[PDB]
Amino acid sequence: XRXXXXXXXXXXXX
Amino acid sequence: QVCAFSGFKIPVAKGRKYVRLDLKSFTFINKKSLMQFLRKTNPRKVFWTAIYRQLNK
Amino acid sequence: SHRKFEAPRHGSLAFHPRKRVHKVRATVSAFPKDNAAEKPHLTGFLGFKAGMTHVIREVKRTNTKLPKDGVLEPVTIIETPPMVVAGFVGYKKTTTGLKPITAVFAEHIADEFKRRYTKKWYKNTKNQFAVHTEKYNDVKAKSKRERQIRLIKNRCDVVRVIAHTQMALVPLKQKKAEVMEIQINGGSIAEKVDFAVSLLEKQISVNSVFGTDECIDVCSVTKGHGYNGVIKRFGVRHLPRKTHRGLRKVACVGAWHPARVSWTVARAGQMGFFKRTEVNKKIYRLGCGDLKNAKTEFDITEKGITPMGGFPHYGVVKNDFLMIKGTVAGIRRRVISLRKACFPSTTRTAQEQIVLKFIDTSSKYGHSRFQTTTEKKARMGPMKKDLE
Amino acid sequence: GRQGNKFRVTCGLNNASTVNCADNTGAKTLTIISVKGFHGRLNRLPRAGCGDMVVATCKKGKPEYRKKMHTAVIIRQRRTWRRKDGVTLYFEDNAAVIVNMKGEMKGSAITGPVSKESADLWPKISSNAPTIV
RNA sequence: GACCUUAAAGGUCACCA
RNA sequence: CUGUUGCUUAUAGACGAUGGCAUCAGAAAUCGGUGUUGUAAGCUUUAGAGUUUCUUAAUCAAUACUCUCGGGUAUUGAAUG
RNA sequence: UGUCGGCUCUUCCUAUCCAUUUCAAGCAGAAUUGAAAAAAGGUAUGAUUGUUCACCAUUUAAUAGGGAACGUGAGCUGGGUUUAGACCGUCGUGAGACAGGUUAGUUUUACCCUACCGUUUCGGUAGAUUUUCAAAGUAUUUAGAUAGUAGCACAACUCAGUACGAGAGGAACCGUUGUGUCACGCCACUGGAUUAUUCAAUUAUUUGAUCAAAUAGUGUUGAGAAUCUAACACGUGUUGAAAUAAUGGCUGAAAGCCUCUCAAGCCAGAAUUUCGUCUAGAUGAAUACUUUGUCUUUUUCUUGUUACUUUAGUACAAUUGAAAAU
RNA sequence: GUCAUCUAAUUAGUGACGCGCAUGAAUGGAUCACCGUGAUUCCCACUGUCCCUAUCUGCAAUCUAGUGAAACCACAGUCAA
RNA sequence: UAAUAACCGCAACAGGUCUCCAAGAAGCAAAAUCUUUAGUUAAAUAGAAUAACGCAGGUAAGGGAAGUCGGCAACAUAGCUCUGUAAGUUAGCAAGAAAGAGUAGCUCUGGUGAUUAUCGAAUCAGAACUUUAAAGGUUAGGGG
């Protein structure tokens, strides 16, 4: 059922 | 009252009484004297005690 | 849902908001209810807290299990040098409360009183009450004074005397006086003004205001502490050790849908410099005249009230003083506004006679052993210095 | 069975505190469960001082006393407590004697000193005490 | 409760949250 | 008049504020009182269990006696001058 | 729109468990049972379970029931449930399924607005002219519309082995003395922290040795003042008047009698309400000094304010406005 | 689940019983000595986990000189019904 | 240069990257701690005040898991010598089981050899005396 979480990264390549 | 270790005159409303299981009760003037008593230190070998100053001179 | 288990709320809602006062002196919010069937008398005074010590008092209450050799109790010392009465003011009862009608001042005013009306004395011209004093004996100005006296006798209900301390008699570095209005309770307004007029320029000693074994009310500003958290300010339960972001705070600051934080929640803020009134405090010794010492009827050695090494952070008490049972609000050097009890206590302990057996005067630093320095030298004997 | 009132004696004995049994009833140690007359509060543990009748279980003793719930009275305690006449006093160990509701001690003798506060509260304890301190 | 079977009785299903 | 500023200011204080003094101001030593610890460094007690070199002279020696109720610290948020 | 429970904390409901006041009983006393006023104050500690729930052991005056997005995760926890690893049982040929069980499994951001808590800065209330007066500025002494509100409960002595009752048993009012909790404080005495690295001792290393230190991020140990503080020390909240609710009554009609009143008029009666008392507090008032005395606007100096300076304009003493009560 | 035992108190643990929804023999059955950063229960010792919080230090946070971003943003920002 | 600034991670990134040489103290030890030769005092800025709430390191009266899903976290044991050591067992183990005692400083005594009277090694055992009664500065098992 309802789960929960998150994360990521990269933020382009300026 | 008179301190058990130092032998000083205990001022009124000052000091703590200690009671042992052998029916003997002592009263001390401060935690400095009480700690020495529980470490089995002889007041005769403690320079500032009133016991020591009576024994010598 | 309901809270699982019930417990009293932490903190009193009677002292909200917790705002710190602005002036060191605390003004009494009330005076004992006037009775017109007695001679005029003052109903208050003002003294400086000197410190605290302990006494052994003989129990005089009967039907009690207290020891017959005495009970160890604390006593607060309040040095109270005589005041100088420098005027009086009449109050009239209107439909919006008391309203001061006129104020009549004396011919000669001390510079301690004048310092209250400036904020930089060393740069001021110090011309306070100059026109009042210079034209005091003029025929025109004298006539105005008589009208003020007669106006009060006609259209006034409450008469108070403006009395100020003499700061030259205390070890405080402050030179500006402390002014307090002491209401006159007693006969009609005719004889109240006559009593007030008689007291102009004179000195009122604390023995004339308070009796012996009399319970009084004390108003003073407590000891400041600054910004303090929820645990110290209110006394909430410290959170478990596992808690993220901290332990010493309130976990829940309100439910979802009052949609706002209530005033009743415990929030971090200022604790300290508040005004508090404590009632029914007994006078143990009226340190005036013969009882200015620390000797008792049982302990006959002569000694002053000041412990060895002076009162900590205060100094030496050499004026009249009061011995109040227990604690009063404020640290040493604080200004305490004494007052006759608004509701006279009628308990058996209130009317109990006080008979002191021993007043402690040992040094309030460390674990002292001696009462006076003369008996310290006698016990210790000559030392390396003094004998050489 | 207690006689009269008791002054303030700071309670140094908690729930689950193990005391000694000064009686001669074959029970060695008792652990306090709850204190008679204790007025409850949230998250507070029951507290007992000298002269306080407690409800305790014997975890060490002869079989007719072990693994059972009895009633005892604290006669001495290691916690420092102050008398009304400015006397500060404390003992060497926490001890208790088994009494019933009516206040009569189950045993016949008490070993070691007995505090005044517990001696005055219970007249039966004071009679069988060697010394009252 | 639903489906099936016997001369009331059984048998299988009754799940994702 | 009021504010800034000074007392590396307090009975106050996150910063503002609040409270006190500002030339009879302030600050600092020093001295006395008052506390804390436990008897300083130098030399002397056959001190001292024993050892060595002598040939009863010394030397080394944990610890320990007298000078020593000594010495040291003490507002920094202690009290006097 | 972060989905259970617990922890923390505040508030609200009464269909009230205790304390207060009353009525009724098949209420002799004690213990009880039914009901009314009343929600201001209290309502606990543990074993087992993730549990809500439940069941036991205690204690208490009582250990009542509920709401607030099934209160409350940028408040916590992650025990359970609810991904991905693994095991067992049953089912399925198989991949795999299981309100079947077991075990391991990342809990992010407030520095924005408001709310709440504290804390500053600037602004400021219109109708008096007895120069003994009036107004503005600075400062003190006061004032109090409003808002909050605090003290509760128990035990012991005496009443008293008395009232009552055949007996068994078995009270209460006044009074006295304590305890617990809550609130406000406080540093004298008792206790705790202690980088005054205070005093002393001492392990390792380095100053040739002694002295005196340093280094081991506070080497460590004993004592340890000050300051802070106690659930660990100790003080105050035993406090006064009036009106009340449920209820019991007085006089008394309606209704010649009766009736406490779904009539007029009164009295007694609560942990109740309001004064009194405590805390914060608006417009205010008095006094001291500096001024001004028909008046402001716009510039302008000052950290800021008032007085003040200059050019002009404006007004110039004289008939207004009171019965009260019903 | 029922009986014992552990506790003052045991939906927990252990020892037994067994018509066992739906155990069971290389889908291995029963048995455990040593071993295990494996799962579970109970004792001793110790303790701020707790009664119930107090206090000490360094680095921040606070204020200032220099320097100086980001998430987010319809407009915005007091309540009751 | 070969890396807390020259290499790879967007960079002067607390991450990562193969080797050679190697002093004293103390100790079983290339352990922790301090120092010599060499290197450096700068390595994303500081000053004042010493509030709350924090991160890191601590202590605490009396009680001792009553807290909690759960002794999580922390406390506690800790070296060496001697005495002693159970059930169970694959007979190898368990076992450092568990449990108890000793340990400092100073002044001495004795054992263990080489060479043929002189010379040399740290190791063990024992005895008087003294004190603040001794592994514990650092390192260093909780047990059933």
Tab-separated table of N, CA, C and O (backbone and C1' of nucleotides) in Angstrom, chain D residues 2-11 15 33-47 55 69 79-80 82-84 88, chain G residues 7-9 43-46 57-63 153-157 177-182 188-191 231-235:
chain	number	residue	atom	x	y	z
D	2	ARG	N	-0.105	1.984	63.165
D	2	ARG	CA	0.818	3.080	63.418
D	2	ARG	C	0.202	4.092	64.378
D	2	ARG	O	-1.008	4.329	64.376
D	3	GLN	N	1.051	4.687	65.210
D	3	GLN	CA	0.631	5.683	66.186
D	3	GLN	C	1.187	7.041	65.783
D	3	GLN	O	2.405	7.208	65.675
D	4	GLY	N	0.300	8.003	65.574
D	4	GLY	CA	0.716	9.370	65.360
D	4	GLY	C	1.217	9.650	63.956
D	4	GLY	O	1.084	8.849	63.026
D	5	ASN	N	1.808	10.832	63.816
D	5	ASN	CA	2.303	11.336	62.547
D	5	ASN	C	3.812	11.160	62.446
D	5	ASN	O	4.507	10.897	63.428
D	6	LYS	N	4.316	11.325	61.228
D	6	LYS	CA	5.743	11.312	60.959
D	6	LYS	C	6.111	12.582	60.210
D	6	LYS	O	5.367	13.031	59.335
D	7	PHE	N	7.255	13.160	60.558
D	7	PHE	CA	7.722	14.349	59.868
D	7	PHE	C	8.264	13.971	58.493
D	7	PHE	O	8.197	12.820	58.059
D	8	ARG	N	8.807	14.958	57.792
D	8	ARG	CA	9.340	14.710	56.462
D	8	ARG	C	10.635	13.923	56.573
D	8	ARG	O	11.597	14.376	57.199
D	9	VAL	N	10.650	12.734	55.987
D	9	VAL	CA	11.846	11.910	55.887
D	9	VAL	C	12.034	11.586	54.416
D	9	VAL	O	11.189	10.916	53.814
D	10	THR	N	13.124	12.077	53.834
D	10	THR	CA	13.317	11.912	52.401
D	10	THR	C	13.424	10.436	52.061
D	10	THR	O	14.152	9.682	52.710
D	11	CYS	N	12.680	10.023	51.042
D	11	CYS	CA	12.543	8.618	50.693
D	11	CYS	C	13.647	8.246	49.714
D	11	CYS	O	13.644	8.696	48.565
D	15	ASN	N	10.741	1.607	44.214
D	15	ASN	CA	10.242	0.319	43.776
D	15	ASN	C	11.406	-0.528	43.275
D	15	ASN	O	12.371	-0.015	42.706
D	33	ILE	N	7.815	-3.506	46.513
D	33	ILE	CA	6.899	-3.508	45.379
D	33	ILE	C	6.155	-2.183	45.346
D	33	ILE	O	6.195	-1.459	44.346
D	34	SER	N	5.473	-1.855	46.439
D	34	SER	CA	4.721	-0.614	46.529
D	34	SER	C	4.638	-0.200	47.987
D	34	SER	O	4.842	-1.008	48.894
D	35	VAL	N	4.325	1.073	48.205
D	35	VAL	CA	4.361	1.682	49.526
D	35	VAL	C	2.943	2.026	49.946
D	35	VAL	O	2.194	2.639	49.180
D	36	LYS	N	2.579	1.631	51.160
D	36	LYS	CA	1.265	1.951	51.692
D	36	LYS	C	1.127	3.452	51.901
D	36	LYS	O	2.024	4.107	52.433
D	37	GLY	N	-0.011	3.994	51.485
D	37	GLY	CA	-0.256	5.412	51.602
D	37	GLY	C	0.371	6.257	50.522
D	37	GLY	O	0.216	7.483	50.554
D	38	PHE	N	1.066	5.651	49.567
D	38	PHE	CA	1.704	6.412	48.505
D	38	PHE	C	0.653	7.011	47.584
D	38	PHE	O	-0.267	6.320	47.142
D	39	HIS	N	0.793	8.300	47.294
D	39	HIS	CA	-0.123	9.012	46.416
D	39	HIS	C	0.492	9.089	45.027
D	39	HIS	O	1.538	9.717	44.841
D	40	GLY	N	-0.168	8.467	44.059
D	40	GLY	CA	0.452	8.241	42.775
D	40	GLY	C	0.620	9.503	41.956
D	40	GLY	O	-0.058	10.512	42.143
D	41	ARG	N	1.557	9.422	41.017
D	41	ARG	CA	1.817	10.479	40.057
D	41	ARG	C	2.300	9.824	38.775
D	41	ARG	O	2.736	8.672	38.779
D	42	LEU	N	2.211	10.560	37.674
D	42	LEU	CA	2.583	9.996	36.385
D	42	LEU	C	4.072	9.684	36.348
D	42	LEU	O	4.904	10.517	36.714
D	43	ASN	N	4.401	8.464	35.922
D	43	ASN	CA	5.772	8.017	35.708
D	43	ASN	C	6.596	7.996	36.989
D	43	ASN	O	7.791	7.701	36.946
D	44	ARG	N	5.980	8.290	38.129
D	44	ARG	CA	6.693	8.273	39.396
D	44	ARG	C	6.752	6.861	39.958
D	44	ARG	O	5.788	6.099	39.863
D	45	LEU	N	7.879	6.519	40.535
D	45	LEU	CA	8.014	5.248	41.223
D	45	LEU	C	7.640	5.400	42.692
D	45	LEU	O	7.851	6.461	43.285
D	46	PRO	N	7.067	4.366	43.303
D	46	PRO	CA	6.760	4.438	44.734
D	46	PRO	C	8.018	4.639	45.562
D	46	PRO	O	9.075	4.084	45.263
D	47	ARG	N	7.892	5.435	46.620
D	47	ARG	CA	9.018	5.852	47.440
D	47	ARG	C	8.760	5.510	48.896
D	47	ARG	O	7.632	5.628	49.376
D	55	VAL	N	5.030	-2.810	50.883
D	55	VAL	CA	4.630	-4.130	50.419
D	55	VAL	C	5.783	-4.692	49.606
D	55	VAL	O	6.150	-4.130	48.569
D	69	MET	N	4.497	-12.451	48.921
D	69	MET	CA	4.328	-11.026	49.167
D	69	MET	C	4.019	-10.807	50.642
D	69	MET	O	3.022	-11.327	51.153
D	79	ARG	N	19.981	6.468	52.716
D	79	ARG	CA	19.742	7.835	52.279
D	79	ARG	C	19.845	8.790	53.457
D	79	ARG	O	19.345	8.514	54.549
D	80	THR	N	20.505	9.919	53.232
D	80	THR	CA	20.664	10.931	54.263
D	80	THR	C	19.367	11.705	54.434
D	80	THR	O	18.838	12.259	53.468
D	82	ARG	N	17.140	14.487	57.229
D	82	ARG	CA	17.366	15.551	58.195
D	82	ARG	C	16.266	15.553	59.241
D	82	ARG	O	15.081	15.481	58.902
D	83	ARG	N	16.659	15.639	60.506
D	83	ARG	CA	15.697	15.784	61.582
D	83	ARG	C	15.268	17.240	61.711
D	83	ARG	O	15.892	18.153	61.165
D	84	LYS	N	14.178	17.454	62.446
D	84	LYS	CA	13.631	18.800	62.572
D	84	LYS	C	14.535	19.707	63.393
D	84	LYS	O	14.498	20.928	63.222
D	88	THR	N	21.566	15.902	60.792
D	88	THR	CA	21.655	15.193	59.527
D	88	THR	C	22.244	13.815	59.789
D	88	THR	O	23.304	13.699	60.410
G	7	C	P	2.122	6.160	26.180
G	7	C	O5'	3.473	6.969	25.983
G	7	C	C5'	4.700	6.473	26.493
G	7	C	C4'	5.852	7.354	26.093
G	7	C	C3'	5.685	8.832	26.399
G	7	C	O3'	6.001	9.152	27.741
G	7	C	C1'	6.443	8.568	24.181
G	8	U	P	5.172	10.283	28.517
G	8	U	O5'	5.504	11.615	27.721
G	8	U	C5'	6.787	12.215	27.799
G	8	U	C4'	6.814	13.516	27.044
G	8	U	C3'	5.715	14.499	27.409
G	8	U	O3'	6.065	15.287	28.531
G	8	U	C1'	5.844	14.277	25.057
G	9	C	P	4.942	15.848	29.525
G	9	C	O5'	4.104	16.849	28.621
G	9	C	C5'	4.661	18.080	28.192
G	9	C	C4'	3.715	18.824	27.287
G	9	C	C3'	2.315	19.039	27.827
G	9	C	O3'	2.239	20.128	28.723
G	9	C	C1'	2.192	18.284	25.596
G	43	U	P	-3.553	13.446	38.123
G	43	U	O5'	-4.413	12.125	37.909
G	43	U	C5'	-4.387	11.098	38.884
G	43	U	C4'	-5.559	10.162	38.751
G	43	U	C3'	-5.684	9.402	37.448
G	43	U	O3'	-4.786	8.317	37.340
G	43	U	C1'	-7.792	10.234	38.068
G	44	A	P	-4.277	7.840	35.896
G	44	A	O5'	-2.793	7.338	36.163
G	44	A	C5'	-1.802	8.236	36.631
G	44	A	C4'	-0.961	7.628	37.726
G	44	A	C3'	-0.128	6.416	37.351
G	44	A	O3'	1.065	6.739	36.664
G	44	A	C1'	-1.235	5.990	39.375
G	45	U	P	1.768	5.641	35.731
G	45	U	O5'	2.370	4.589	36.759
G	45	U	C5'	3.332	4.977	37.727
G	45	U	C4'	3.833	3.787	38.503
G	45	U	C3'	4.337	2.635	37.662
G	45	U	O3'	5.660	2.848	37.213
G	45	U	C1'	2.921	1.810	39.360
G	46	G	P	6.172	2.162	35.862
G	46	G	O5'	6.379	0.643	36.276
G	46	G	C5'	6.067	-0.404	35.375
G	46	G	C4'	5.985	-1.730	36.082
G	46	G	C3'	5.821	-2.940	35.183
G	46	G	O3'	7.053	-3.397	34.662
G	46	G	C1'	4.240	-3.038	36.926
G	57	A	P	-4.766	-11.149	40.825
G	57	A	O5'	-3.475	-10.508	41.490
G	57	A	C5'	-2.246	-11.214	41.487
G	57	A	C4'	-1.081	-10.295	41.733
G	57	A	C3'	-1.309	-9.190	42.743
G	57	A	O3'	-1.198	-9.646	44.077
G	57	A	C1'	-0.219	-8.316	40.838
G	58	U	P	-1.978	-8.883	45.250
G	58	U	O5'	-1.928	-7.361	44.800
G	58	U	C5'	-1.907	-6.319	45.756
G	58	U	C4'	-0.816	-5.323	45.463
G	58	U	C3'	-1.090	-3.909	45.933
G	58	U	O3'	-0.797	-3.737	47.304
G	58	U	C1'	-0.302	-3.861	43.711
G	59	U	P	-1.935	-3.226	48.306
G	59	U	O5'	-1.838	-1.643	48.203
G	59	U	C5'	-0.584	-0.987	48.307
G	59	U	C4'	-0.578	0.314	47.550
G	59	U	C3'	-1.747	1.243	47.818
G	59	U	O3'	-1.592	1.995	49.005
G	59	U	C1'	-1.398	1.072	45.492
G	60	U	P	-2.877	2.389	49.877
G	60	U	O5'	-3.562	3.553	49.040
G	60	U	C5'	-2.846	4.731	48.702
G	60	U	C4'	-3.597	5.551	47.687
G	60	U	C3'	-5.013	5.940	48.070
G	60	U	O3'	-5.061	7.067	48.925
G	60	U	C1'	-5.005	5.085	45.873
G	61	A	P	-6.013	7.058	50.217
G	61	A	O5'	-7.371	7.702	49.695
G	61	A	C5'	-8.623	7.385	50.290
G	61	A	C4'	-9.758	7.826	49.403
G	61	A	C3'	-9.744	7.235	48.001
G	61	A	O3'	-10.471	6.022	47.962
G	61	A	C1'	-10.031	9.597	47.896
G	62	A	P	-10.017	4.818	47.013
G	62	A	O5'	-10.361	5.332	45.548
G	62	A	C5'	-11.703	5.500	45.120
G	62	A	C4'	-11.752	6.053	43.720
G	62	A	C3'	-10.851	5.348	42.717
G	62	A	O3'	-11.492	4.238	42.110
G	62	A	C1'	-10.500	7.690	42.605
G	63	U	P	-11.183	2.734	42.580
G	63	U	O5'	-9.648	2.519	42.232
G	63	U	C5'	-9.243	2.177	40.913
G	63	U	C4'	-9.133	3.400	40.043
G	63	U	C3'	-8.519	3.174	38.665
G	63	U	O3'	-9.122	4.069	37.735
G	63	U	C1'	-7.227	4.743	39.852
G	153	A	P	-10.308	19.259	48.237
G	153	A	O5'	-9.681	17.829	48.526
G	153	A	C5'	-9.548	16.882	47.481
G	153	A	C4'	-8.464	15.884	47.780
G	153	A	C3'	-8.485	15.283	49.169
G	153	A	O3'	-9.439	14.251	49.308
G	153	A	C1'	-6.281	15.917	48.617
G	154	C	P	-10.040	13.900	50.753
G	154	C	O5'	-8.867	13.098	51.464
G	154	C	C5'	-8.389	11.880	50.920
G	154	C	C4'	-7.050	11.506	51.501
G	154	C	C3'	-7.030	11.232	52.992
G	154	C	O3'	-7.475	9.931	53.318
G	154	C	C1'	-5.235	12.653	52.434
G	155	A	P	-8.193	9.659	54.724
G	155	A	O5'	-6.990	9.612	55.764
G	155	A	C5'	-5.945	8.662	55.628
G	155	A	C4'	-4.765	9.003	56.503
G	155	A	C3'	-5.056	9.169	57.984
G	155	A	O3'	-5.113	7.926	58.660
G	155	A	C1'	-3.684	10.946	57.233
G	156	A	P	-6.008	7.751	59.981
G	156	A	O5'	-5.160	8.465	61.119
G	156	A	C5'	-3.926	7.922	61.559
G	156	A	C4'	-3.292	8.804	62.602
G	156	A	C3'	-4.189	9.194	63.765
G	156	A	O3'	-4.231	8.200	64.773
G	156	A	C1'	-3.097	11.114	62.926
G	157	C	P	-5.463	8.135	65.798
G	157	C	O5'	-5.308	9.454	66.676
G	157	C	C5'	-4.252	9.589	67.615
G	157	C	C4'	-4.394	10.849	68.429
G	157	C	C3'	-5.742	11.048	69.099
G	157	C	O3'	-5.848	10.332	70.315
G	157	C	C1'	-5.070	13.056	68.039
G	177	U	P	-1.928	23.627	65.583
G	177	U	O5'	-1.218	22.268	65.164
G	177	U	C5'	-0.502	21.503	66.119
G	177	U	C4'	-0.174	20.127	65.599
G	177	U	C3'	0.591	20.066	64.292
G	177	U	O3'	1.970	20.338	64.448
G	177	U	C1'	-1.145	18.466	64.274
G	178	G	P	2.861	20.697	63.165
G	178	G	O5'	3.268	19.279	62.579
G	178	G	C5'	3.517	19.116	61.193
G	178	G	C4'	3.217	17.711	60.743
G	178	G	C3'	3.434	17.438	59.267
G	178	G	O3'	4.789	17.175	58.957
G	178	G	C1'	1.333	16.593	59.920
G	179	U	P	5.400	17.652	57.557
G	179	U	O5'	4.866	16.567	56.526
G	179	U	C5'	5.074	15.184	56.757
G	179	U	C4'	4.256	14.347	55.809
G	179	U	C3'	4.350	14.732	54.345
G	179	U	O3'	5.504	14.210	53.717
G	179	U	C1'	2.085	14.431	54.936
G	180	G	P	6.155	14.966	52.461
G	180	G	O5'	5.135	14.676	51.277
G	180	G	C5'	4.953	13.358	50.787
G	180	G	C4'	3.862	13.298	49.751
G	180	G	C3'	3.975	14.291	48.611
G	180	G	O3'	4.881	13.874	47.608
G	180	G	C1'	1.760	14.276	49.432
G	181	U	P	5.682	14.959	46.742
G	181	U	O5'	4.583	15.534	45.747
G	181	U	C5'	3.900	14.681	44.843
G	181	U	C4'	2.691	15.362	44.260
G	181	U	C3'	2.954	16.684	43.564
G	181	U	O3'	3.405	16.521	42.233
G	181	U	C1'	1.125	16.920	45.036
G	182	C	P	4.376	17.612	41.572
G	182	C	O5'	3.427	18.861	41.332
G	182	C	C5'	2.363	18.789	40.397
G	182	C	C4'	1.492	20.014	40.461
G	182	C	C3'	2.209	21.343	40.334
G	182	C	O3'	2.529	21.679	39.000
G	182	C	C1'	0.711	21.446	42.139
G	188	A	P	23.852	32.418	50.737
G	188	A	O5'	23.603	31.982	52.244
G	188	A	C5'	23.815	30.641	52.650
G	188	A	C4'	23.385	30.427	54.074
G	188	A	C3'	23.564	29.022	54.619
G	188	A	O3'	24.884	28.794	55.071
G	188	A	C1'	21.415	29.839	55.180
G	189	C	P	25.691	27.497	54.593
G	189	C	O5'	24.992	26.304	55.374
G	189	C	C5'	25.160	26.143	56.771
G	189	C	C4'	24.201	25.119	57.311
G	189	C	C3'	24.274	23.749	56.661
G	189	C	O3'	25.301	22.939	57.199
G	189	C	C1'	22.027	24.457	56.737
G	190	U	P	26.212	22.044	56.230
G	190	U	O5'	25.200	20.973	55.637
G	190	U	C5'	24.864	19.803	56.364
G	190	U	C4'	24.162	18.802	55.486
G	190	U	C3'	24.817	18.526	54.146
G	190	U	O3'	25.889	17.610	54.224
G	190	U	C1'	22.526	18.915	53.814
G	191	G	P	27.067	17.669	53.139
G	191	G	O5'	26.387	17.138	51.803
G	191	G	C5'	25.886	15.813	51.708
G	191	G	C4'	25.196	15.581	50.390
G	191	G	C3'	26.013	15.912	49.154
G	191	G	O3'	26.888	14.866	48.784
G	191	G	C1'	23.854	16.850	48.953
G	231	A	P	13.032	19.854	43.382
G	231	A	O5'	11.890	18.752	43.415
G	231	A	C5'	11.919	17.700	44.366
G	231	A	C4'	11.536	16.389	43.734
G	231	A	C3'	12.157	15.153	44.358
G	231	A	O3'	11.536	14.701	45.541
G	231	A	C1'	12.522	15.075	42.066
G	232	C	P	12.442	13.981	46.650
G	232	C	O5'	13.692	14.954	46.807
G	232	C	C5'	14.989	14.574	46.354
G	232	C	C4'	15.994	14.642	47.475
G	232	C	C3'	16.148	16.014	48.128
G	232	C	O3'	16.297	15.856	49.533
G	232	C	C1'	18.248	15.242	47.387
G	233	A	P	15.359	16.682	50.536
G	233	A	O5'	16.202	17.991	50.851
G	233	A	C5'	17.269	17.958	51.784
G	233	A	C4'	17.625	19.342	52.258
G	233	A	C3'	16.465	20.196	52.731
G	233	A	O3'	16.122	19.922	54.076
G	233	A	C1'	17.854	21.452	51.284
G	234	C	P	14.594	19.961	54.555
G	234	C	O5'	14.177	21.482	54.378
G	234	C	C5'	14.714	22.484	55.224
G	234	C	C4'	14.344	23.859	54.738
G	234	C	C3'	12.872	24.219	54.810
G	234	C	O3'	12.520	24.680	56.105
G	234	C	C1'	13.824	24.934	52.741
G	235	G	P	11.009	25.083	56.466
G	235	G	O5'	10.869	26.595	55.987
G	235	G	C5'	9.590	27.204	55.923
G	235	G	C4'	9.592	28.465	55.098
G	235	G	C3'	8.248	28.858	54.514
G	235	G	O3'	7.424	29.529	55.447
G	235	G	C1'	9.911	29.016	52.847
